[PDB]
Amino acid sequence: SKQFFMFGPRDLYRPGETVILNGLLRDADGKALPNQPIKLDVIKPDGQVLRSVVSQPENGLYHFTWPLDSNAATGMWHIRANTGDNQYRMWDFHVEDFMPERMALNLTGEKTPLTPKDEVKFSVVGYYLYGAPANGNTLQGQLFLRPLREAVSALPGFEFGDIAAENLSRTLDEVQLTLDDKGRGEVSTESQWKETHSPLQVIFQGSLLESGGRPVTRRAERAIWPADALPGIRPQFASKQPIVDEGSNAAFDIVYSDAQGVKKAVSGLQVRLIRERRDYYWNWSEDEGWQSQFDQKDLIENEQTLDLKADETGKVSFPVEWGAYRLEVKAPNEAVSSVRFWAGYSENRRLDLALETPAKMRPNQPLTVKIKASTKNGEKPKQVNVLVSAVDSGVLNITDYVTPDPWQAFFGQKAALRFGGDGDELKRGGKPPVNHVNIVVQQALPVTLNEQGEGSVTLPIGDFNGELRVMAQAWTADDFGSNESKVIVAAPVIAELNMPRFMASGDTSRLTLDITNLTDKPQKLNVALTASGLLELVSDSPAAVELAPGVRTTLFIPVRALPGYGDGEIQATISGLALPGETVADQHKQWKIGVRPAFPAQTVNYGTALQPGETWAIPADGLQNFSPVTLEGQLLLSGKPPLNIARYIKELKAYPYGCLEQTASGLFPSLYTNAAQLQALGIKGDSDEKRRASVDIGISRLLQMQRDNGGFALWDKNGDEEYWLTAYVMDFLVRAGEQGYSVPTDAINRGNERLLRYLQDPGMMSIPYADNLKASKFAVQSYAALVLARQQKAPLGALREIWEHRADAASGLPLLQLGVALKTMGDATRGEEAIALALKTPRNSDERIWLGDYGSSLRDNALMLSLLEENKLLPDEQYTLLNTLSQQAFGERWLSTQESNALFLAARTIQDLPGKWQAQTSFSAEQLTGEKAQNSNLNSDQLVTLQVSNSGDQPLWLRMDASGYPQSAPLPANNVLQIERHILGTDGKSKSLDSLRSGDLVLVWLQVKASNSVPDALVVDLLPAGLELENQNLSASLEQSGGEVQNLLNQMQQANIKHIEFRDDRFVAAVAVDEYQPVTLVYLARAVTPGTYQVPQPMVESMYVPQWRATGAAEDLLIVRP
């Protein structure tokens, strides 16, 4: 069937850096195949496809590299491969803003389960990867105590421990340790879970802290039991908490087991079926927090006893009746295990490979590797190809990169639119500062070994301190194998600096300079320090130093971070160790950091449209407010539509039922479209047969609301006549037949002859609720005019008489109706006048005055437009009216079904019409053109002088958005939506920001709420350099079992969140936010660098309309001491 081994130097890249992917193709057997290509596709987190290739193989091997984009979205990416099979093999790989480790951490306890009173202790082993051990490096940690449910790891499905056991999950005392011992340190706890009859586990999450700096954090787990062996329960039912369907019986498998020791036996196991009545709940809103929930009582329903012999899988079954139960087996010894359920709601041909490699080496000189393959024979069958890569070991430990082993790869068995042009999610938050961390990765060419299975590569190594990992893979046509080797690289004396990931301009940190002697002879040096760029030394370093062999002591370097955006640098010139051996006298080192401002960027949004020959320039004072260094702009130049938010509304279906307006407004648009247009208009209403069939129904239904005199009532033919709707209804019924519907003849006639008497004798007409009868009656008369006029049944005489009562008119809509009525029956000169008047008559938009036309400024335009499309009239105004209608989009909070339709009927127009635009620009002196709509990115200098001029036959529409850091902290700006930031502790209680020592964890609470529905929201919490997010997307490093106050976690879980990114300087969340609905975001961070840091304001924006943003309230300064 074909098997494709995908493999690479690593699975953790970092936005910016090039990716390497390798491939080998074999069959079901694992033998070679005929030479062929393999389509590879690169896949972004969301699901889209960045790029794709047809990888040709050179010499049995597939290779694929491509440069991962600086602003690429952090997530998990995939490369997948079509093997013609139409099953895609995926190669997953991480992209995160990540920091290679520079240290290691082994933590162990023996794997034997303890007993209740047995204290718990763990091993610690702190060691820098250049060789040295953490001598005196402190260690933060947290000791948790969590229920251990799947204790028998050879019987997953069986659950162990009393599911209702009070207080089983606690977070025990915090860990704190100098580990002065060059080797190590140790961590114990005394038992406090005497009581339990349930199997528990103690969990240690430990962080080994670099010198005034980052953590390298790992967790160890140490099981705990209460008996020799424990009772187990597997509920037979599935699909989660498991439950019986109805009042059916509760099927269970039941057992008794040792640590893994299968099936030990005792009789007298007391099985019970406990039920839980839960009544009473809630608490006053504005309790702060809000509400609370139910209390319960537990009563027994069976006391059935079951016996069990060794190797026996018990089986109890019990009928139940619609409540929350739980099954609770009690062992003689006293270990209990409950489980809860609710009845309702709510072969060796591998090639032996060995690697000749130094155990240790200095940097800057090539690393030579030699490869010999035993082949499990005298000599290795055919040609030996070997590919060999080298990777900084601190990169592979975060992923825990198992080296790729081809052998067991072959033989190893048993989304429509957001609007975010790519990539803007960052851009709007503001250019991130540039992160200079350098990753060390080399891959060699594939080698063909000799006839003795021997060969050698030389991987040139640069300036580096730490462990390397050499890895190699080998293949013949039929045989495969691999191996890895750990090659330390150090200097005679290491000096590596410690910095935060960035610094906000104004921030001040105290960088630590690690410096270790690996020479054996004591040495005396002078570390002369310079700082240039947007970074300056505040004070004066210790001049000279002195060290024994194998000892490091650090220097502290305090640093004012200068205003602006760019890069700062620290130069060390290190004098000493002038050598007749190493051939050296001095050594110069450089280190660089990114400086950005301390507040989030802003954006500005212009949109207009230009009929040919018009020119759009940009305001002079419009960008006046931004820092130009970091300002960029988009300029989408669509030639087909306006705002065109055909969506932002829907689904749309046929509702034949209800009163007369429900019914009419229910069907009125279903006349004019079908599934086709709909599943292509990005919305789907009704099966095409269900729509027609459902119109047919509402027709015959309306007819029965037709009174004798031919006009209509709301519910029955005996109803009080409703005047304006009688017109409306007819309009529908007339239109109906033109769209292939059957309307009875006279029914329509009885109605028309009535509509006439709407023109001739308004005296009869009495409108029930509405005032301004003058205007209400006029509006009625003109709708009735149109309708009859379409039929050629609107007598030119009566159209005049109403043409002079025109001063009564409230809206322009009637006039436009009456213009077209006139136009069509003769007398175009009144028509043209009545029309041309209509267009310059607006409605007062307070509209509580209630005229009985169900209208508004909003729809009467949408209809005045939907009219002109029909008659092909005054197309110049058509754009004008359309553009004014576009702008009813800001005012799209709660539209009626009449405004919806009347819009949708104007909107369905846009779909077909092209398209074609042409325009001159300030930039690209060439004529820009396009079939569709095209974006164009602009820098500061381009856009400050930006002008755009149409050049074509059609009008175009241009949107621009421009984003960059301002000169000065935006004052807190609530608009549409808004945002609070609260720094909670680890114990869930607001933390004094001045109270922070390094290594401390902190919980950040973002409450985001809105007055609209804003589905393209963008949360962007910038950071104070003091903090660094503890990334979860990864993790071998740190978790939200750590987070105690679930109040909020639970909430977060509900919210519709497209993605959360954890990035060097920014918390970023794309999300949908609503009214009546807050959106709780919580994210875990740590304080690393000591100093005093400016806290940005938290912000959020709507992607589509940037004017919808909320700069939240600025917090005070963050101070970190140690």
Swiss-Prot record:
It is found in: Cell inner membrane. Keywords: Cell inner membrane, Cell membrane, Coiled coil, Lipoprotein, Membrane, Palmitate, Protease inhibitor, Signal, Thioester bond. It is a lipid-anchor. It comes from the Bacteria. Its main location: membrane. GO terms for cellular component: extracellular space; plasma membrane. Residues 1031-1058 form a coiled coil. The keyword Lipoprotein applies. One of its GO terms (biological process) is defense response. One of its GO terms (molecular function) is endopeptidase inhibitor activity. There is a cross-link at C659-Q662 (Isoglutamyl cysteine thioester (Cys-Gln)). May form homooligomers. Bacterial alpha-2-macroglobulins were probably acquired one or more times by horizontal gene transfer from metazoan hosts. Cleavage causes major structural rearrangement of more than half the 13-domain structure from a native to a compact induced form. Protects the bacterial cell from host peptidases. Acts by a 'trapping' mechanism. Cleavage of the bait-region domain by host peptidases leads to a global conformational change, which results in entrapment of the host peptidase and activation of the thioester bond that covalently binds the attacking host peptidase. Trapped peptidases are still active except against very large substrates. May protect the entire periplam, including the lipoproteins anchored to the periplasmic side of the outer membrane, against intruding endopeptidases. This is Alpha-2-macroglobulin. The lineage of its organism: Bacteria, Pseudomonadati, Pseudomonadota, Gammaproteobacteria, Enterobacterales. The gene is yfhM. The chain holds residues 385 to 1653 of 1653 of the full protein.
